[PDB]
Amino acid sequence: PGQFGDIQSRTPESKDVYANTQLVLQRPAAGTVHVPYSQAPSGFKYWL
């Protein structure tokens, strides 16, 4: 996660996607309907 290669695929048009982004769902805040999560940002952008 967070590095080059966090999401990978054999070819751009392929539907086989491997993703290891450390996606953990978090408890929503009281009185709200949002869906919070703690996810490592895109490793491709950080590489860029």
Partner 1 sequence: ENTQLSEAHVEKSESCKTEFASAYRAHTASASAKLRVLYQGNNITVTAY
Partner 2 sequence: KVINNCKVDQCHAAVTNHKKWQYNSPLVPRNAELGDRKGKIHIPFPLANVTC
Partner 3 sequence: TDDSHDWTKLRYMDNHMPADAERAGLFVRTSAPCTITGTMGHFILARCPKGETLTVGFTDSRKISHSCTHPFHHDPPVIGREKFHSRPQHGKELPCSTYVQSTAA
Ligand X SMILES: *[C@@H]1O[C@H](CO)[C@@H](O[C@@H]2O[C@H](CO)[C@@H](O[C@@H]3O[C@H](CO)[C@@H](O)[C@H](O[C@H]4O[C@H](CO)[C@@H](O)[C@H](O)[C@@H]4O)[C@@H]3O)[C@H](O)[C@H]2NC(C)=O)[C@H](O)[C@H]1NC(C)=O
User: Residues in the site for partner 2, rule: CB under 8 A?
Assistant: 33-35
Residue 9 within binding range of partner 1, rule CB under 8 A:
yes
Question: How far apart are the C-alpha atoms of 17 and 5, rounded to whole Å?
Answer: 11
Q: How far is the CB of 2 from partner 2 (least distance, A)?
A: 23
Question: How far apart are the C-alpha atoms of 48 and 44, rounded to whole Å?
Answer: 6
Residue 48 within binding range of partner 3, rule CB under 8 A:
yes
Give whole-number Cα distances, 37 to 2, 15, 46, 48, in Å: 15, 25, 19, 24
Binding residues vs partner 1 (CB under 8 A): 4-5, 7, 9, 12-13, 17, 19, 21, 23, 25, 28, 35, 37, 44, 47
